[PDB]
Amino acid sequence: GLFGAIAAFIEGGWTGMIDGWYGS
């Protein structure tokens, strides 16, 4: 969630942040 948001943020930009955050 926390790390997923940061990692997804760098990969899927803003959209990635949301998905990473909700990415259980």
Side-chain angles (χ1 to χ4, degrees):
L2 174 58
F3 292 93
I6 304 173
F9 168 65
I10 302 164
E11 277 56 274
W14 183 282
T15 316
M17 190 180 67
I18 300 173
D19 183 62
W21 181 252
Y22 277 93
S24 179

Short mmCIF file of all heavy atoms in Angstrom, two decimals:
data_model
loop_
_atom_site.label_atom_id
_atom_site.label_comp_id
_atom_site.label_asym_id
_atom_site.label_seq_id
_atom_site.Cartn_x
_atom_site.Cartn_y
_atom_site.Cartn_z
N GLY A 1 0.86 -1.22 0.00
CA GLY A 1 0.00 0.00 0.00
C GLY A 1 0.88 1.24 0.00
O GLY A 1 0.89 2.00 -0.97
N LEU A 2 1.61 1.44 1.09
CA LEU A 2 2.49 2.60 1.20
C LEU A 2 3.58 2.55 0.13
O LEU A 2 3.70 3.46 -0.69
CB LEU A 2 3.14 2.62 2.61
CG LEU A 2 4.18 3.77 2.70
CD1 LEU A 2 3.50 5.12 2.38
CD2 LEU A 2 4.80 3.80 4.14
N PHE A 3 4.36 1.48 0.14
CA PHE A 3 5.43 1.33 -0.84
C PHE A 3 4.85 1.17 -2.23
O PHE A 3 5.39 1.70 -3.20
CB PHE A 3 6.30 0.12 -0.49
CG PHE A 3 7.06 0.39 0.79
CD1 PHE A 3 6.53 -0.02 2.02
CD2 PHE A 3 8.30 1.04 0.74
CE1 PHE A 3 7.24 0.23 3.21
CE2 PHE A 3 9.01 1.29 1.93
CZ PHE A 3 8.48 0.88 3.16
N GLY A 4 3.75 0.44 -2.34
CA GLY A 4 3.11 0.23 -3.63
C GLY A 4 2.73 1.56 -4.27
O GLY A 4 2.85 1.72 -5.49
N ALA A 5 2.28 2.51 -3.45
CA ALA A 5 1.89 3.82 -3.96
C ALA A 5 3.09 4.56 -4.53
O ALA A 5 3.00 5.18 -5.59
CB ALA A 5 1.27 4.65 -2.83
N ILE A 6 4.21 4.49 -3.82
CA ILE A 6 5.43 5.16 -4.27
C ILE A 6 5.98 4.50 -5.53
O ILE A 6 6.36 5.17 -6.49
CB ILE A 6 6.49 5.13 -3.17
CG1 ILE A 6 5.90 5.76 -1.88
CG2 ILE A 6 7.73 5.93 -3.62
CD1 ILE A 6 6.88 5.58 -0.70
N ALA A 7 6.02 3.17 -5.52
CA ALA A 7 6.53 2.42 -6.66
C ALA A 7 5.62 2.60 -7.87
O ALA A 7 6.08 2.83 -8.99
CB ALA A 7 6.63 0.93 -6.30
N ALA A 8 4.32 2.50 -7.64
CA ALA A 8 3.36 2.65 -8.71
C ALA A 8 3.34 4.09 -9.20
O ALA A 8 3.03 4.34 -10.36
CB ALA A 8 1.97 2.26 -8.22
N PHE A 9 3.69 5.02 -8.33
CA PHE A 9 3.71 6.43 -8.70
C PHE A 9 4.80 6.69 -9.74
O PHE A 9 4.59 7.42 -10.69
CB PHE A 9 3.97 7.30 -7.45
CG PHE A 9 4.28 8.73 -7.87
CD1 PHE A 9 3.30 9.50 -8.51
CD2 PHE A 9 5.55 9.28 -7.62
CE1 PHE A 9 3.59 10.81 -8.91
CE2 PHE A 9 5.83 10.59 -8.01
CZ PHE A 9 4.86 11.35 -8.65
N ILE A 10 5.94 6.09 -9.55
CA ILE A 10 7.05 6.25 -10.47
C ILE A 10 6.78 5.52 -11.79
O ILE A 10 7.28 5.92 -12.85
CB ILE A 10 8.33 5.72 -9.85
CG1 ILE A 10 8.59 6.46 -8.52
CG2 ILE A 10 9.51 5.96 -10.81
CD1 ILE A 10 9.61 5.68 -7.69
N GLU A 11 6.01 4.42 -11.73
CA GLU A 11 5.71 3.62 -12.93
C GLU A 11 4.43 4.10 -13.65
O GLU A 11 4.43 4.32 -14.85
CB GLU A 11 5.54 2.15 -12.52
CG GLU A 11 6.91 1.48 -12.43
CD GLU A 11 7.80 2.25 -11.46
OE1 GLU A 11 8.43 3.20 -11.89
OE2 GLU A 11 7.84 1.88 -10.30
N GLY A 12 3.33 4.22 -12.88
CA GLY A 12 2.04 4.65 -13.47
C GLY A 12 1.68 6.06 -13.05
O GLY A 12 0.51 6.41 -12.91
N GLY A 13 2.70 6.88 -12.86
CA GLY A 13 2.50 8.27 -12.47
C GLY A 13 1.41 8.40 -11.41
O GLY A 13 1.26 7.54 -10.55
N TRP A 14 0.65 9.49 -11.47
CA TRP A 14 -0.42 9.73 -10.51
C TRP A 14 -1.39 8.55 -10.46
O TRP A 14 -1.70 8.03 -9.39
CB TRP A 14 -1.18 10.99 -10.88
CG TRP A 14 -2.21 11.27 -9.84
CD1 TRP A 14 -3.39 10.64 -9.74
CD2 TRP A 14 -2.16 12.24 -8.76
NE1 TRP A 14 -4.09 11.17 -8.66
CE2 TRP A 14 -3.36 12.16 -8.03
CE3 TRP A 14 -1.20 13.18 -8.35
CZ2 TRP A 14 -3.61 12.96 -6.93
CZ3 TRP A 14 -1.44 14.01 -7.23
CH2 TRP A 14 -2.65 13.89 -6.52
N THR A 15 -1.87 8.13 -11.63
CA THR A 15 -2.80 7.00 -11.71
C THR A 15 -2.24 5.78 -10.98
O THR A 15 -2.97 5.06 -10.31
CB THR A 15 -3.06 6.65 -13.19
OG1 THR A 15 -3.26 7.85 -13.93
CG2 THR A 15 -4.31 5.77 -13.31
N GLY A 16 -0.95 5.57 -11.13
CA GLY A 16 -0.30 4.44 -10.48
C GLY A 16 -0.34 4.58 -8.96
O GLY A 16 -0.46 3.59 -8.24
N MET A 17 -0.24 5.81 -8.48
CA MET A 17 -0.27 6.06 -7.04
C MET A 17 -1.58 5.58 -6.44
O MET A 17 -1.59 4.92 -5.40
CB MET A 17 -0.09 7.55 -6.76
CG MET A 17 0.12 7.76 -5.26
SD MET A 17 0.34 9.54 -4.93
CE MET A 17 -1.33 10.08 -5.37
N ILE A 18 -2.69 5.92 -7.09
CA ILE A 18 -4.00 5.51 -6.60
C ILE A 18 -4.12 4.00 -6.58
O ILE A 18 -4.54 3.42 -5.57
CB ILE A 18 -5.10 6.10 -7.50
CG1 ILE A 18 -5.01 7.64 -7.47
CG2 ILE A 18 -6.51 5.64 -6.97
CD1 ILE A 18 -5.98 8.22 -8.49
N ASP A 19 -3.77 3.36 -7.69
CA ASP A 19 -3.85 1.90 -7.78
C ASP A 19 -2.94 1.24 -6.75
O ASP A 19 -3.33 0.28 -6.09
CB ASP A 19 -3.44 1.45 -9.18
CG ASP A 19 -3.60 -0.06 -9.30
OD1 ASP A 19 -4.72 -0.54 -9.16
OD2 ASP A 19 -2.60 -0.73 -9.53
N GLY A 20 -1.72 1.76 -6.61
CA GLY A 20 -0.77 1.21 -5.66
C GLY A 20 -1.29 1.34 -4.23
O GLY A 20 -1.11 0.44 -3.41
N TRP A 21 -1.91 2.48 -3.94
CA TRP A 21 -2.44 2.73 -2.60
C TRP A 21 -3.55 1.73 -2.27
O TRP A 21 -3.60 1.19 -1.17
CB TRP A 21 -3.00 4.15 -2.51
CG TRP A 21 -3.51 4.40 -1.13
CD1 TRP A 21 -4.82 4.49 -0.79
CD2 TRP A 21 -2.76 4.59 0.10
NE1 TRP A 21 -4.91 4.72 0.57
CE2 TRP A 21 -3.67 4.79 1.16
CE3 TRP A 21 -1.38 4.60 0.40
CZ2 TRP A 21 -3.24 5.00 2.47
CZ3 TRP A 21 -0.94 4.82 1.72
CH2 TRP A 21 -1.87 5.01 2.75
N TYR A 22 -4.44 1.49 -3.23
CA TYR A 22 -5.54 0.56 -3.03
C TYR A 22 -5.11 -0.87 -3.37
O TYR A 22 -5.89 -1.81 -3.26
CB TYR A 22 -6.74 0.96 -3.92
CG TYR A 22 -7.54 2.05 -3.23
CD1 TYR A 22 -7.27 3.40 -3.51
CD2 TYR A 22 -8.55 1.71 -2.33
CE1 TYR A 22 -8.01 4.40 -2.88
CE2 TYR A 22 -9.28 2.72 -1.69
CZ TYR A 22 -9.01 4.06 -1.97
OH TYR A 22 -9.74 5.05 -1.34
N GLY A 23 -3.85 -1.02 -3.78
CA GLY A 23 -3.32 -2.33 -4.13
C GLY A 23 -2.97 -3.12 -2.88
O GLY A 23 -1.85 -3.06 -2.38
N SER A 24 -3.95 -3.87 -2.37
CA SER A 24 -3.73 -4.67 -1.17
C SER A 24 -2.58 -5.65 -1.38
O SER A 24 -1.84 -5.89 -0.44
CB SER A 24 -5.00 -5.45 -0.82
OG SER A 24 -4.76 -6.24 0.33
#
